């Protein structure tokens, strides 16, 4: 029905059913998580296999079958033959090392469980970074990627709980998304925190003057290197795009795009121009000595192009010689039979 | 119509949210057998894969009448203050107690079956062939209390979303449903025969001439040309771009966030939450408004234009809406 309520119902149902007991429940999952890490690393040690493969082979058996490996990540890991062969090596590990996969499997089990239980925390957080230019669901989910980031670095040894820790790792993820995505034209996190301060500073300024501040006053208030040219520009880049398709004039049936002209495409006038221009620019090119005419024609007309480096073997005295003598003979006869005189464009 | 699924609501049921339709097979019951094509709720579904789980409190200071491994008694008061549901074993951290439906197979010699393996009655679990598992389900090799508990959920293909429908759509041998309907058509009464004509129509064309039906599910979204969704310099520093580009971003961002969510690790509430968003977005570029209406940001509570409606506006009923060169 309405996509907010059933998700809320979805995880709020789960936090309600699985609120994590303050100290205990988080303590267990957390320590289990860390033993998974160590386990995985000592596994890489005894197997010569990378931790990325241990995290993923143990994730496959605990989180999903062939299904999850084949569709999400295309295909470099045969889910069956590859993952089960990995599981093989793990079994071979005697009573000693085997203990580490057995631990690793739960290590992650515990992991996902904690992420589920705190989805509430995200939504409650995410709830306030609402009208920033991001969808409630979008906000909630990047905040979610934030809580996961948190689960990776949480050291239970340091007594503080995951609540205060997820708060920060989440607010960071959210704020980064808001800056990095909210707009059409991308703008780095600096122009973002920059422009927000301008508007912030603005509001404060209006509190006094009853005069929407001249850019002079925004420069000041902002600080060290702020000048008119800066505020004006920022206020321009901050100006988001206009929708190419807006109801125009009377709202009836008027799209905005019909009004915008075309600028690469040569209107018929231009097609006619470059027709004669090349037709007769080509006539002059053939009637001239190819030596320095083609040199300057191709070193200025074909690809981009330097006097000395312009002529093949002959130096600059014959370049300047023919360039300036052919170019003028060409121009003074073009003066007689005025074809080019009418400045083509 | 083609896939015989309640045409309207059975789809929006699995499609946009999580009501999972049992695709190939699912041995464990609800009360009855495997619902080849029927759909169930996440609440009952949850009841189907972990087994059963019900944890309960302790007043500050009371002791439980049951021990660590003493199987909870069907319909027993685990500790003063609570009344636990039927099949289980009793567990307890220093506040609450926890019930479990799978039977405990205490092992003292090391457990070699690994957590997660699919198990059927007999599959070795621990202490060599001594500890054999007698029930169907996943494996949970707990080692605090040295034990091997076997959950009861056999592999049940519970799937939701276009994933589920893509499957169902590939598995159909239209020529079977054609013959099957041809006879449901002419023989029974008009009620079920009539609705069968209607369902035979689509299947006939698919097969007749043209292309096959697996393609109705999208996994590769074509993107309209760029010069057709310009980015242009207007006046002063203002840029104007085709609404479509704001939808495309949506899709792209969600699609990406998805991938990163799969690789990072995957709490499944979070993967579906986005798989939904993703679906909605996939709609948006195609056709906006048949379900929920997208708006870039305050200024225009105006539905972002969309492919579908660009084409329509072309020749649709209005005075000549946008008809004329």
UniProtKB/Swiss-Prot annotation, chain A:
Annotated DNA-binding ranges come to: 306-324
Q: Where is this region: Sigma-70 factor domain-4?
A: 284-331
A GO MF annotation of the entry reads: sigma factor activity
Keywords (A to Z) from UniProt = Cytoplasm, DNA-binding, Sigma factor, Transcription, Transcription regulation
* Subcellular location, principal: cytoplasm
The disulfide bonds in this chain are none
State any GO BP term from the record.
DNA-templated transcription initiation
Q: Which GO terms describe its cellular component?
A: cytoplasm
Region described as Sigma-70 factor domain-1: spans on this chain: 5-40
Segments carrying the region annotation (Sigma-70 factor domain-2) are 114-184
Per UniProt, subcellular location reads as: Cytoplasm
Domain of life, per lineage? Bacteria
Chain positions covered by the region annotation Sigma-70 factor domain-3: 193-271
Where is the motif (Interaction with polymerase core subunit RpoC)? 138-141
In the record's own words, the domains note is: Contains 4 domains, connected by flexible linkers. In the active conformation, the domains are in an extended conformation, each making extensive interactions with the RNA polymerase catalytic core. In the autoinhibited state, sigma-70 factor domain-1 packs closely together with sigma-70 factor domains-2 and -4, contrary to the extended conformation that is seen when the protein is part of the RNA polymerase holoenzyme.
Outline what the protein does. Answer: Sigma factors are initiation factors that promote the attachment of RNA polymerase to specific initiation sites and are then released. This sigma factor is the primary sigma factor during exponential growth.
Q: Which family does it belong to?
A: Belongs to the sigma-70 factor family. RpoD/SigA subfamily.
Quaternary structure and interacting proteins, as annotated:
Interacts transiently with the RNA polymerase catalytic core formed by RpoA, RpoB, RpoC and RpoZ (2 alpha, 1 beta, 1 beta' and 1 omega subunit) to form the RNA polymerase holoenzyme that can initiate transcription.
Query: What is the official name of this protein in its record?
Result: RNA polymerase sigma factor SigA
Q: Organism, per UniProt?
A: Thermus thermophilus (strain ATCC BAA-163 / DSM 7039 / HB27)
The range of the complete sequence contained here reads 74 to 423 of 423
From Swiss-Prot, chain B:
GO aspect biological process, one term: DNA-templated transcription
Q: Quote a single Gene Ontology cellular component term.
A: DNA-directed RNA polymerase complex
Alphabetized UniProt keyword annotations: DNA-directed RNA polymerase, Magnesium, Metal-binding, Nucleotidyltransferase, Transcription, Transferase, Zinc
Q: Is Metal-binding included in the keywords of this UniProt record?
A: yes
The protein's GO terms of the molecular function aspect are: DNA binding; DNA-directed RNA polymerase activity; magnesium ion binding; zinc ion binding
* Superkingdom, taxonomy of origin: Bacteria
Family under the similarity heading: Belongs to the RNA polymerase beta' chain family.
Q: What does this protein do?
A: DNA-dependent RNA polymerase catalyzes the transcription of DNA into RNA using the four ribonucleoside triphosphates as substrates.
| Subunit structure comment from the entry | The RNAP catalytic core consists of 2 alpha, 1 beta, 1 beta' and 1 omega subunit. When a sigma factor is associated with the core the holoenzyme is formed, which can initiate transcription.
Protein name as it appears in the record: DNA-directed RNA polymerase subunit beta'
Species of origin: Thermus thermophilus (strain ATCC 27634 / DSM 579 / HB8)
Encoding gene per record:
rpoC
Q: Which residues of the full protein are shown?
A: 114 to 621 of 1524
């Amino acid at each position: 029905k309405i996509s907010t309520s059933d998700p809320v119902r979805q995880y709020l149902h789960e936090i309600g059913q699985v609120p994590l007991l303050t100290l205990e429940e988080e303590v267990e999952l957390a320590r289990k998580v860390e033993e998974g890490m160590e386990a995985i690393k000592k596994l890489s040690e005894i197997t010569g296999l990378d931790p990325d493969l241990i995290r993923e082979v143990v994730r496959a058996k605990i989180l999903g079958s062939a299904r999850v490996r084949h569709i999400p990540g295309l295909k470099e890991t045969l889910d069956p033959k590859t993952v089960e062969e990995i599981d093989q090596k793990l079994k071979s590990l005697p009573k000693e090392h085997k203990r580490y996969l057995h631990i690793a499997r739960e290590g992650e089990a515990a992991r996902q469980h904690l992420i589920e239980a705190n989805l509430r925390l995200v939504v409650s957080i995410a709830k306030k970074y609402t009208g920033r230019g991001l969808s409630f669901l979008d906000l909630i989910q990047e905040g979610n990627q934030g809580l996961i980031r948190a689960v990776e670095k949480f050291e239970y040894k340091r007594r503080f709980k995951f609540s205060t820790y997820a708060t920060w790792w989440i607010r960071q993820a959210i704020n980064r998304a808001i800056a990095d995505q909210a707009r059409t034209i991308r703008i780095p996190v600096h122009m973002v925190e920059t422009i927000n301060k301008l508007s912030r500073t603005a509001r404060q300024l209006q509190q006094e003057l009853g005069r929407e501040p001249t850019y002079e006053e925004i420069a000041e208030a902002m600080g060290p290197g702020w000048d008119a040219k800066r505020v004006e520009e920022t206020l321009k880049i901050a100006q988001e795009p206009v929708s190419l398709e807006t109801p125009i004039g009377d709202e009836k049936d008027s799209f905005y795009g019909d009004f915008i002209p075309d600028e690469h495409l040569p209107s018929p006038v231009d097609a006619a121009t470059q027709s004669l221009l090349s037709e007769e620019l080509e006539k002059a090119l053939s009637k001239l000595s190819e030596r320095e005419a083609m040199v300057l024609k191709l070193r200025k007309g074909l690809i981009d192009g330097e006097e000395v480096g312009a002529f093949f073997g002959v130096t600059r005295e014959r370049i300047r010689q023919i360039e300036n003598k052919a170019l003028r003979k060409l121009k003074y006869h073009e003066s007689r039979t005025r074809k080019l005189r009418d400045f083509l464009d | 119509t083609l896939l015989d699924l309640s045409a309207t609501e059975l789809e929006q049921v699995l499609y946009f949210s999580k009501y999972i339709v049992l695709d190939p097979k699912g041995a464990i019951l609800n009360g009855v057998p495997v619902e080849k094509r029927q759909l169930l709720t996440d609440e009952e579904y949850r009841e189907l894969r972990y087994g059963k789980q019900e944890t309960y409190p302790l007043p500050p200071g009371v002791d439980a009448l049951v021990k660590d491994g003493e199987e909870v008694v069907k319909g027993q008061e685990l500790a003063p203050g609570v009344v636990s549901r039927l099949d289980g074993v009793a567990l307890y951290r220093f506040a609450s107690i926890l019930v479990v439906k799978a039977r405990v197979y205490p092992f003292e010699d090391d457990v070699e079956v690994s957590t997660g393996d699919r198990v059927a009655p007999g599959d070795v679990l621990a202490d060599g062939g001594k500890v054999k598992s007698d029930v169907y389900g996943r494996v949970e090799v707990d080692l605090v209390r040295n034990v091997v508990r076997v959950v009861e959920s056999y592999d049940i293909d519970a799937r939701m979303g276009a994933e589920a429908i893509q499957q169902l759509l590939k598995e159909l041998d239209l020529e079977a449903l054609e013959k099957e309907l041809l006879e449901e058509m002419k023989h029974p009464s008009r009620a079920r025969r009539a609705k069968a004509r209607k369902r035979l129509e689509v299947v006939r064309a698919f097969l007749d001439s043209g292309n096959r039906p697996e393609w109705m599910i999208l996994e590769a979204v074509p993107v309209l040309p760029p010069d057709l969704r310009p980015m242009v310099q207007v006046d002063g520093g203002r840029f104007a771009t085709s609404d479509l580009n704001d939808l495309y971003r949506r899709l792209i961002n969600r699609n990406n966030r998805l991938k990163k969510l799969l690789a990072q690790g995957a709490p499944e509430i979070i993967i579906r939450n986005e798989k939904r968003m993703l679906q909605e977005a996939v709609d948006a570029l195609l056709d906006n408004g048949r379900r929920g209406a997208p708006v870039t940001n305050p200024g225009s509570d105006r539905p972002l234009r969309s492919l579908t409606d660009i084409l329509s506006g072309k020749q649709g009923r209005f005075r000549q809406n946008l008809l004329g060169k």
